[PDB]
RNA sequence: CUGGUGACUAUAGCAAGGAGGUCACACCUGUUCCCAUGCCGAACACAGAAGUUAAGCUCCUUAGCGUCGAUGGUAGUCGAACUUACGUUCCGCUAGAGUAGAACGUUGCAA
RNA sequence: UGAUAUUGAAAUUCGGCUUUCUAACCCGCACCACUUAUCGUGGUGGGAGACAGUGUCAGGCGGGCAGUUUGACUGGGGCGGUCGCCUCCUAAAAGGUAACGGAGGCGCUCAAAGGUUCCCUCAGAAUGGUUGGAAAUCAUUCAUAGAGUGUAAAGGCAUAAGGGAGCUUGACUGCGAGACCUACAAGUCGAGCAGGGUCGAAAGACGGACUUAGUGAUCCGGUGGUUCCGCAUGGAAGGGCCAUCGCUCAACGGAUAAAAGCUACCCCGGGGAUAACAGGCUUAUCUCCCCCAAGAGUUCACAUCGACGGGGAGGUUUGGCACCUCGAUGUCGGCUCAUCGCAUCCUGGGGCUGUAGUCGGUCCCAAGGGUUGGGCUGUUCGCCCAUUAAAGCGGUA
RNA sequence: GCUGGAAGGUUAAGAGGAGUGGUUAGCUUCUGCGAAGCUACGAAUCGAAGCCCCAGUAAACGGCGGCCGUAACUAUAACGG
RNA sequence: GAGGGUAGCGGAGAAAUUCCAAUCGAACCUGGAGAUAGCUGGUUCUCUCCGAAAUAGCUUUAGGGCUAGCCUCAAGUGAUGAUUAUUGGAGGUAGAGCACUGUUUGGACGAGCGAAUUCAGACAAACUCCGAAUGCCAAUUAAUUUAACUUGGGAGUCAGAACAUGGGUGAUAAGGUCCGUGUUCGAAAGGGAAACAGCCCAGACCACCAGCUAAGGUCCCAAAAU
RNA sequence: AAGCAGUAAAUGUGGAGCCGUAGCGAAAGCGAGUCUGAAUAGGGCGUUUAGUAUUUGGUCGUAGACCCGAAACCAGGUGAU
């Protein structure tokens, strides 16, 4: 099933994002590389 | 008895918003359409939904894209 | 007059019959190298002895198909007068036939 | 029903349960006195006793009683059905356009089914070989789309938007000249500027998916961040700003956090804006009258009957519409009194006949006169009994 | 619905006070620790009736069925599934 | 018969919603009180200029409102308004046609061949190889004309009807009902149709015992040709 | 303005107060420029920077608000001739 998820920056200041994810297709937590406004650089977001 | 019909959707208002040989600005909408009925020519772009808009200032000309095909162009006249 | 590359509704096309090659476009040989395959040097990429116009390609002819297409009339219809289906005045179709038509045409190499 | 105050005094195993005692409190229990009154008060004896009764707080039952809610559209109302969004037709080649008109969907999905760079071209038909649909795979030819495009439809796409592979996360941040639509609130597209980036040799492309549906104002509440404020002062509680979460509020511009029925006991303000009777328009239905002739009639269409089909008249039935009347036009049968039409029941006059005669059938002219009494049923209607030349059909609220 | 019962489950006020946070005498890397007072919110455990549960009660409220074949009965079924 | 008791969130009832001073599904009097009424009725002197609407959206909304459209007054900008004449353009209706999807008639074609192949002939709002007349958007282009736009004060309107024309629905019924496009009535008197809001002609400032015409008419009623 | 004087008199005193001359931002705050924003880079709202006191007319709000008209509700009393 679909669950709305949020992405939090790692080891730095938080620049949150909102996406969607399927519960069965990706049972774990997804990680991506997104731009961070506070650090002014691309970083890794989890959860 | 009863009926099973009666539903409808709000009418979207497409067509040509500009006339041939008319001066337009740099962001005017020239045509609203579903799919491609008129192709983009010179100085003409395309949007998310298939819509034609001008990029520069000038007249509007509807031309012929060969056989059974159409295009619109904007020319920087004055 | 052959080649490269752009512009126009097949009047630029499909098909059939003929002529040509060592300058060029092609065919063909091979897989050490730059590269690749559901497997497959068949194709993509390379190094190139030979050999032939067979086929691609250039040119000529053919109205078999496809395309373009008048004049005249007809259908329909703006407006007007009677009335309810008929007059008068403009515009003017499809379809079918007489017919153009085996393409014109710009620019830098080469002979 | 429990906790607590009035509420005391002693003992048992583990802050209490249980069992004893009398002074609190209680007795519409007896005797005495105020008093020739037992209403009341006081005293003396009995009974019960920290129980009961009363005060405050808490849980449960509670139409016995009280205040209110119980939606709209609608060829009258009730019943049935529907309410927001998307795609066609009606829609009259710009845009827009209604009806309980004619057809279907939506309340999603995808971590690659997104971005970029390369490569490629489908469906169908014929033939051949271990024959399962010459189409479960091997191979050849014809084949401009009939194949695919996640999901309805329309508009598009073979420069592919269709199929394959590599890399990657732009499904980024702050914005935004101009424009479409529009009562408002909302909705749509957008070149370009700056800060990080992915793919590509490079020019370049990238702010989700070929496009158009997958969504809900405000108030209130929860979580993360913050040069903001914070009631004498420094903090804090509490607010503001930014991001995000919780509503089949689906009657989907959402009355409130919280809501169903009967009225023949009924009442008030309005309406012929809207029904039941009669009038009016129409004639589906109804009653009659015709066209053609396959046939029946021993032969023979038309003495008589008239299948399959077609064209009319009338306004007596059941309907459709809702034009006058709701500050009133009073129904069904029966009685009294009638009047009009002819599509004629009797009487008068003619033609044909499958008319021998007495009787019959059918058609034409004709409205002067006539056209019964009872039983059953409120009945119109109908059946029955007995007669008669005949026991006619309709209009007039 | 009414009556009887308490083996188990749920349940208030009120008792109970494990802990959390705010303030600061002091110390100290300087924006952290931090005693006692005062203050805001509190967790384990105890707490009746009622409800779930068990049984009875109809001159209490109430309720009292289908499908398919067959003669020592022509049709029809005493009977059978 | 006399003397007494029970009083309206109440009494009494051999029970009918029966009675409680000619009234009772809740008595009478006075106050809150000039309760509320999105509903009917009514609203008093005279002249001049201009002059509608019965539509869209939303609505516990449907005979009520709000915003927009249309009317009026004042102050502002200044060809920005309408009709024709000549070009350019978007958009598939009438008609026609079978090249697509479906329907259908008769013959050749064995794999039953009036459709797996071929030749003729027809049908379609949800078919199109094609395609008008009108209407619509502009030019910064020429003659004629008089309007358009912006900001402010005040409104009314949300029940429409008939006729001609293209349609849906009904039954190619209705003075039926719902849409598009015009005229009239509404809010319009005068002439014609016998009389007759919507049909035809034509828009009344006042006075005259003056002339020419429109629609329809000229034997008499009854003006005009036996 | 209230108050004081004055004939219940229209006139003097009374400068608490109010409007305007400067906006922007939720606020701290800045200021002809402010907010958003890393950045007047762009954008929003400002730089008109002539008002103010009284009064005639039109409209709106609070009071019954153009007038007449209920079926009903609550409170206090009077009635069993």
mmCIF file of C-alpha atoms (C1' of nucleotides) in Angstrom, chain D residues 274-395:
data_model
loop_
_atom_site.group_PDB
_atom_site.id
_atom_site.type_symbol
_atom_site.label_atom_id
_atom_site.label_comp_id
_atom_site.label_asym_id
_atom_site.label_seq_id
_atom_site.Cartn_x
_atom_site.Cartn_y
_atom_site.Cartn_z
ATOM 1 C "C1'" U D 274 -49.701 23.267 -8.130
ATOM 2 C "C1'" A D 275 -53.343 18.246 -7.974
ATOM 3 C "C1'" A D 276 -58.873 15.857 -7.169
ATOM 4 C "C1'" C D 277 -64.964 17.273 -10.575
ATOM 5 C "C1'" A D 278 -66.704 20.059 -14.853
ATOM 6 C "C1'" G D 279 -64.722 23.550 -19.181
ATOM 7 C "C1'" G D 280 -60.382 24.137 -23.045
ATOM 8 C "C1'" C D 281 -56.142 21.967 -26.900
ATOM 9 C "C1'" U D 282 -54.630 16.893 -28.961
ATOM 10 C "C1'" U D 283 -56.652 12.061 -30.481
ATOM 11 C "C1'" A D 284 -52.326 7.665 -28.190
ATOM 12 C "C1'" U D 285 -56.658 4.703 -26.632
ATOM 13 C "C1'" C D 286 -62.262 4.283 -27.925
ATOM 14 C "C1'" U D 287 -66.776 4.002 -31.485
ATOM 15 C "C1'" C D 288 -67.850 4.011 -36.592
ATOM 16 C "C1'" C D 289 -67.053 4.398 -42.090
ATOM 17 C "C1'" C D 290 -63.756 3.194 -46.343
ATOM 18 C "C1'" C D 291 -59.140 1.290 -50.263
ATOM 19 C "C1'" C D 292 -56.593 -3.684 -52.588
ATOM 20 C "C1'" A D 293 -58.347 -8.694 -52.984
ATOM 21 C "C1'" A D 294 -55.533 -14.158 -50.825
ATOM 22 C "C1'" G D 295 -59.648 -16.998 -49.970
ATOM 23 C "C1'" A D 296 -64.477 -19.577 -47.738
ATOM 24 C "C1'" G D 297 -69.034 -20.137 -49.999
ATOM 25 C "C1'" U D 298 -70.091 -28.117 -54.301
ATOM 26 C "C1'" U D 299 -68.478 -24.452 -59.614
ATOM 27 C "C1'" C D 300 -68.258 -18.961 -58.907
ATOM 28 C "C1'" A D 301 -63.592 -12.976 -55.091
ATOM 29 C "C1'" C D 302 -67.510 -9.116 -54.330
ATOM 30 C "C1'" A D 303 -75.931 -12.986 -51.930
ATOM 31 C "C1'" U D 304 -73.019 -13.228 -47.205
ATOM 32 C "C1'" C D 305 -68.196 -13.433 -44.813
ATOM 33 C "C1'" G D 306 -62.959 -10.396 -45.576
ATOM 34 C "C1'" A D 307 -56.374 -12.727 -43.973
ATOM 35 C "C1'" C D 308 -51.760 -9.952 -44.858
ATOM 36 C "C1'" G D 309 -51.409 -4.505 -45.447
ATOM 37 C "C1'" G D 310 -53.250 1.071 -46.177
ATOM 38 C "C1'" G D 311 -56.326 5.941 -45.668
ATOM 39 C "C1'" G D 312 -60.194 8.860 -42.714
ATOM 40 C "C1'" A D 313 -64.646 10.913 -39.525
ATOM 41 C "C1'" G D 314 -66.587 11.904 -34.384
ATOM 42 C "C1'" G D 315 -65.300 14.019 -29.589
ATOM 43 C "C1'" U D 316 -69.763 9.577 -25.684
ATOM 44 C "C1'" U D 317 -64.409 5.840 -22.503
ATOM 45 C "C1'" U D 318 -59.272 5.478 -20.296
ATOM 46 C "C1'" G D 319 -55.331 8.887 -20.848
ATOM 47 C "C1'" G D 320 -51.446 13.536 -22.166
ATOM 48 C "C1'" C D 321 -51.031 19.248 -21.125
ATOM 49 C "C1'" A D 322 -51.922 22.369 -16.821
ATOM 50 C "C1'" C D 323 -54.977 27.759 -20.090
ATOM 51 C "C1'" C D 324 -60.096 30.169 -16.102
ATOM 52 C "C1'" U D 325 -61.813 29.310 -10.980
ATOM 53 C "C1'" C D 326 -58.568 27.649 -3.802
ATOM 54 C "C1'" G D 327 -61.090 36.418 0.036
ATOM 55 C "C1'" A D 328 -65.350 28.401 -2.293
ATOM 56 C "C1'" U D 329 -67.695 26.680 -9.738
ATOM 57 C "C1'" G D 330 -71.019 21.359 -3.894
ATOM 58 C "C1'" U D 331 -69.885 14.597 -5.993
ATOM 59 C "C1'" C D 332 -72.379 9.019 -7.474
ATOM 60 C "C1'" G D 333 -77.136 6.706 -8.159
ATOM 61 C "C1'" G D 334 -82.765 7.645 -7.682
ATOM 62 C "C1'" C D 335 -87.516 11.281 -8.304
ATOM 63 C "C1'" U D 336 -90.004 15.662 -11.187
ATOM 64 C "C1'" C D 337 -89.601 18.189 -15.908
ATOM 65 C "C1'" A D 338 -87.824 18.165 -20.433
ATOM 66 C "C1'" U D 339 -85.083 19.517 -25.066
ATOM 67 C "C1'" C D 340 -81.683 18.430 -29.398
ATOM 68 C "C1'" G D 341 -78.805 14.928 -33.313
ATOM 69 C "C1'" C D 342 -79.108 10.741 -36.691
ATOM 70 C "C1'" A D 343 -74.519 6.620 -37.071
ATOM 71 C "C1'" U D 344 -82.947 4.185 -37.321
ATOM 72 C "C1'" C D 345 -85.388 -0.280 -32.405
ATOM 73 C "C1'" C D 346 -90.938 -0.112 -34.467
ATOM 74 C "C1'" U D 347 -93.970 2.017 -38.163
ATOM 75 C "C1'" G D 348 -93.896 4.294 -44.141
ATOM 76 C "C1'" G D 349 -91.106 3.870 -49.057
ATOM 77 C "C1'" G D 350 -87.072 0.997 -52.628
ATOM 78 C "C1'" G D 351 -82.464 -2.118 -54.891
ATOM 79 C "C1'" C D 352 -79.806 -7.053 -54.628
ATOM 80 C "C1'" U D 353 -80.148 -12.023 -52.977
ATOM 81 C "C1'" G D 354 -77.651 -18.694 -52.815
ATOM 82 C "C1'" U D 355 -85.699 -14.026 -52.793
ATOM 83 C "C1'" A D 356 -90.827 -20.827 -54.789
ATOM 84 C "C1'" G D 357 -94.836 -18.975 -50.341
ATOM 85 C "C1'" U D 358 -95.205 -17.473 -44.765
ATOM 86 C "C1'" C D 359 -90.336 -15.902 -42.784
ATOM 87 C "C1'" G D 360 -85.012 -13.978 -43.570
ATOM 88 C "C1'" G D 361 -79.747 -11.290 -44.726
ATOM 89 C "C1'" U D 362 -77.550 -6.597 -46.705
ATOM 90 C "C1'" C D 363 -77.721 -1.790 -48.520
ATOM 91 C "C1'" C D 364 -80.470 3.367 -49.780
ATOM 92 C "C1'" C D 365 -84.159 7.569 -48.504
ATOM 93 C "C1'" A D 366 -86.741 9.032 -44.208
ATOM 94 C "C1'" A D 367 -86.357 12.155 -37.101
ATOM 95 C "C1'" G D 368 -93.767 12.680 -37.895
ATOM 96 C "C1'" G D 369 -95.189 9.750 -33.766
ATOM 97 C "C1'" G D 370 -93.914 5.804 -30.450
ATOM 98 C "C1'" U D 371 -90.298 3.160 -27.648
ATOM 99 C "C1'" U D 372 -93.237 -1.960 -20.599
ATOM 100 C "C1'" G D 373 -93.843 -3.689 -15.499
ATOM 101 C "C1'" G D 374 -90.921 -6.453 -11.819
ATOM 102 C "C1'" G D 375 -86.609 -9.818 -8.602
ATOM 103 C "C1'" C D 376 -80.958 -9.166 -6.876
ATOM 104 C "C1'" U D 377 -77.532 -5.034 -5.926
ATOM 105 C "C1'" G D 378 -76.457 2.476 -3.017
ATOM 106 C "C1'" U D 379 -75.228 1.315 -7.503
ATOM 107 C "C1'" U D 380 -74.050 3.115 -13.528
ATOM 108 C "C1'" C D 381 -73.534 -1.926 -15.413
ATOM 109 C "C1'" G D 382 -75.143 -6.861 -15.544
ATOM 110 C "C1'" C D 383 -78.208 -11.499 -15.050
ATOM 111 C "C1'" C D 384 -83.179 -13.355 -14.534
ATOM 112 C "C1'" C D 385 -89.196 -13.381 -14.986
ATOM 113 C "C1'" A D 386 -93.443 -11.988 -17.766
ATOM 114 C "C1'" U D 387 -95.208 -9.022 -22.042
ATOM 115 C "C1'" U D 388 -94.974 -5.822 -26.501
ATOM 116 C "C1'" A D 389 -95.119 -3.381 -33.267
ATOM 117 C "C1'" A D 390 -90.538 -2.070 -30.675
ATOM 118 C "C1'" A D 391 -88.456 -2.733 -25.585
ATOM 119 C "C1'" G D 392 -82.664 2.380 -30.047
ATOM 120 C "C1'" C D 393 -77.701 4.928 -29.476
ATOM 121 C "C1'" G D 394 -75.664 9.718 -27.853
ATOM 122 C "C1'" G D 395 -75.251 15.612 -26.316
#
